[PDB]
């Protein structure tokens, strides 16, 4: 039997199978406690639990696709949707440090230590995987993954104990203490292997193709319009007909989508109580851009997220500025004009999406509370689904010697750490590209850069990512 | 979210055409970016 490190995407006219492999490292915990919290806010505080476990977060898109493979994805296909996912934990080498006392560290190898692996197929434990935090994976396959520690927030009971105003969320009857050691635990010793084998639900595709037409300009530019438009107001209408030059008063049969607090340049847009509780709903809905290119510069929005760096790394949503969205887009009403910045849902509407890019998420989670709309596509990129890919928790073990009969001899957790290899494969159901009788060469697919500093390549940790994000809508539909 | 680990994305600091985004730590709970919004509250008030 052959032991392999697998990596690489294989394309077809149908789905592409993209696998990657990293080296993980379950470090250590000198205390295997649970370590509740002590936040004690003073102005609704938080209340958590710090589990001694390690989950892994392969959420982003820049791990399954190389930049050459992402460029081959954009210039050849016109949709993408995942349908399968397997996570194999390869060769495990749990080892122990012997503390040379004069050298400090000497690492032998342990055959009796193990690595407790739990897969949460039943969704019993809280899901913290898809929120966009700075522990995902290395972008390049040569660096070592350090998987994050598992922790979660619960709901408790806010008290007010202190001197001035000190609040503290204590435990209530609704609060929960999920001990992960009440489960089934593939114990997974040295050399052991384990798999997950998830299967994605039917999700709508992401349509990696722009438009060569405005949605409000879909008419014959000649010929006028069969209908009329008012001239006088005040009870005596006196409607007139239209010519072909009436472009700003052409009647549309479909409205644009909502623009709830789209502005340009804290908390952004925010719900909450009077002025100071005020939790943020930062990257808007998915129907809104937060960065595009107007006639002179880049407009950058209040509701933007930076994706790195600062100056920021924002995706250029040029396909939302086209179809009647954008940042400083007011709506006007002739009520006895009222400039409004919020646009409502407007029963017949189309708002296409905020575009996915090379570094976006893949799923988040739709929360278990009911009556969702629309929630098929989450913000921060990705899909977002009921029953997401389950979390793979990885503790090592507390091997706890020696004793000597009465004594607390030694360290009693001796010291152990585990290295390994995680090979994650995911298949994406690709759709065929939309037809164009176009005759023009379509624009080329290359990541954006400015001058001299090229995109993904080593320079004199070396490897540098571009200033703008590499979006995915660069071929035209033609609507 | 994980109550540790911060957030991979950023949040604005200055406004007026020069953004100067900054990163986040684990204590930024009131400006954590959510991927799902709450539902409508058309005339929810008290007495």
């Amino acid at each position, epitope marked *: 039997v052959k032991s392999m490190w697998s990596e690489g995407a294989t394309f077809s006219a149908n789905s592409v199978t993209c696998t990657f492999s990293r080296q993980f490292l379950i470090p*250590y915990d*000198p205390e295997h406690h649970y*370590k509740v919290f*002590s*936040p*004690a*806010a*003073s*102005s609704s*505080p938080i209340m958590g639990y*710090s589990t001694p476990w390690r989950y892994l977060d392969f959420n982003a898109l820049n791990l399954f696709f190389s930049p050459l493979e992402f460029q081959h994805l954009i210039e050849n296909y016109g949709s993408i949707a995942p349908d399968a996912l397997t996570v194999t934990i390869s060769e495990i080498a749990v080892k122990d440090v012997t*503390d040379k*006392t004069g050298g*400090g560290v000497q690492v032998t190898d342990s055959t009796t230590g193990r690595l407790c692996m739990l897969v949460d197929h039943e969704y019993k434990y809280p899901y913290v995987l898809g929120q966009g935090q*700075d522990t995902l994976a290395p972008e390049l396959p040569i660096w070592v993954y350090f998987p994050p*520690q598992y922790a979660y927030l619960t709901v408790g009971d806010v008290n007010t104990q*202190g*001197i*001035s105003g*000190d609040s503290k969320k204590l435990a209530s009857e609704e609060s929960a203490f999920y001990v992960l050691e009440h489960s089934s635990f593939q114990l997974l010793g040295t050399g052991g292997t384990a798999t997950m084998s998830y299967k994605f639900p039917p999700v709508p595709p992401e349509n990696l193709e722009g438009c060569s037409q405005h949605f409000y300009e879909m008419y014959n530019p000649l010929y006028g319009s069969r209908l009329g438009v008012p001239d006088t107001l005040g009870g005596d209408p006196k409607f007139r007909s239209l010519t072909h030059e009436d472009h700003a008063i052409q009647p549309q049969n479909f409205m644009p989508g909502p623009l709830v607090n789209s502005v340009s340049t804290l908390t952004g847009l925010s719900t909450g109580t009077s002025q100071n509780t005020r939790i943020s709903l930062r990257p808007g809905p998915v129907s809104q851009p937060y960065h595009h290119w107007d006639t002179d510069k880049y407009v950058t929005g209040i509701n933007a997220i930076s994706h790195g760096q600062g100056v920021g790394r924002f995706p250029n949503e040029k396909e939302q500025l086209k179809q009647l969205q954008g940042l400083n887009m007011h709506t006007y009403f002739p009520n006895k004009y009222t400039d409004q910045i919020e646009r409502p849902l407007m029963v017949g509407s189309v708002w296409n999406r905020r575009a996915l890019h090379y570094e976006s998420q893949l799923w988040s989670k739709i929360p278990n509370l009911d009556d969702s709309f629309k929630t098929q596509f989450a913000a921060l990129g990705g899909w977002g689904l009921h029953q997401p890919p389950p979390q793979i928790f990885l503790k090592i073990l507390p091997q706890s010697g020696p004793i000597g009969g009465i004594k607390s001899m030694g*360290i009693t957790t001796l010291v152990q750490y585990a290295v390994g290899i995680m090979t994650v494969t995911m298949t994406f159901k690709l759709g065929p590209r939309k037809a164009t009788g176009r005759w023009n060469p379509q624009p080329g697919v290359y990541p954006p850069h400015a001058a001299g500093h090229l995109p993904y390549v080593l320079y004199d940790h070396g490897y540098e990512k571009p200033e703008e994000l590499w979006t995915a809508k660069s071929r035209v539909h033609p609507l | 979210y994980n*109550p*540790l*680990y*911060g957030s991979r994305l950023g949040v604005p*600091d200055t406004l007026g055409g020069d953004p100067k985004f*900054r*990163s*986040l*730590t*684990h*204590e*930024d*709970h*009131a*400006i954590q970016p959510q991927n799902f919004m709450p539902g409508p509250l058309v005339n929810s008030v008290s007495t």
Partner: antibody, heavy 121, light 102 residues
Framework: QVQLQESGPGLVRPSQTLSLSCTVSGASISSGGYYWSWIRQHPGKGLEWIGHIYYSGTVYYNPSLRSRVSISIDNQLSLKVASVTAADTAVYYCARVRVDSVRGAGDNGFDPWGHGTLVTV | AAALTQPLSVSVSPGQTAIFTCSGD??????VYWFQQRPGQSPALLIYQDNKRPSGIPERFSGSNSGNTATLTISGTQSTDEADYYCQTWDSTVVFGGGTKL
């Protein structure tokens, strides 16, 4: 450069609210991840830590001085230690720590300190 | 740990070293920070993360952290290092040490 200047009221013995303040110069305090500590030092003895506060309201306290002191922020970094029947006057420093990444162990230390005020009790 | 141990004072001459002890339970898997407090002045961050020094601190200060102790070694002590040195860790709140009076 970032400097921290204190404010001392003087001396009040018969159990009044000891109020302090620490205006930060060089950089604003609601500009990102930095704790803001209050640290004591008894003359002839080691240092003592009261508590630190983030700009979004969350404040950690010392478990020994928990029900006496109160840290607050109105771009002022106040401290309102009451019940001064125990005659602790020592010294009151301000200090800033960069907020760590993993929340488990402290990745940074108190690099910018204050000048220190001498309260008497 | 939650209670750092540190002796009272040390005696040194110019031309040699003075190594202090900052004892503590499981201090090897922790960060220890050293603070230089000259008399009449606030402390300054001397050695952070058990080996590193900032730009304002000269290159004659170095430390270590192994097992249940963390040392601070001064290489070639001058006539201006007579200062109280405190070790400080983070046992989930903050833990300050006693201080070796030099």
């Amino acid at each position: 450069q970032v400097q921290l200047q204190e404010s001392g009221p003087g001396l009040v013995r018969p159990s009044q609210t000891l109020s302090l303040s620490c205006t930060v110069s060089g950089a604003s305090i609601s500009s990102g991840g930095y704790y803001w500590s209050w640290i004591r030092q008894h003359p002839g003895k080691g240092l003592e830590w009261i508590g630190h506060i983030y700009y979004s309201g969350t404040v950690y306290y010392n478990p020994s001085l928990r029900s006496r002191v109160s840290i607050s922020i109105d771009n002022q970094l106040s401290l309102k230690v009451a019940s001064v029947t125990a005659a602790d006057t020592a010294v009151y420093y301000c200090a800033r720590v960069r907020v760590d990444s993993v929340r488990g162990a402290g990745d940074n230390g108190f690099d910018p300190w204050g000048h220190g005020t001498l309260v008497t009790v | 740990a939650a209670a750092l141990t540190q002796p009272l004072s040390v005696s040194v001459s110019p031309g040699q070293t003075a190594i202090f002890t900052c004892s503590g339970d499981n201090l090897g898997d922790k960060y220890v920070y050293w603070f230089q407090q000259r008399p009449g002045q606030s402390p300054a961050l001397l050695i952070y993360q058990d080996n590193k020094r900032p730009s304002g601190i000269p290159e004659r200060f170095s430390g270590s952290n192994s097992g249940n102790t963390a040392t601070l070694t001064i290489s070639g002590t001058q006539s201006t290092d007579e200062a109280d040195y405190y070790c400080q860790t983070w046992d989930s709140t903050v833990v300050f040490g006693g201080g070796t009076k030099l």
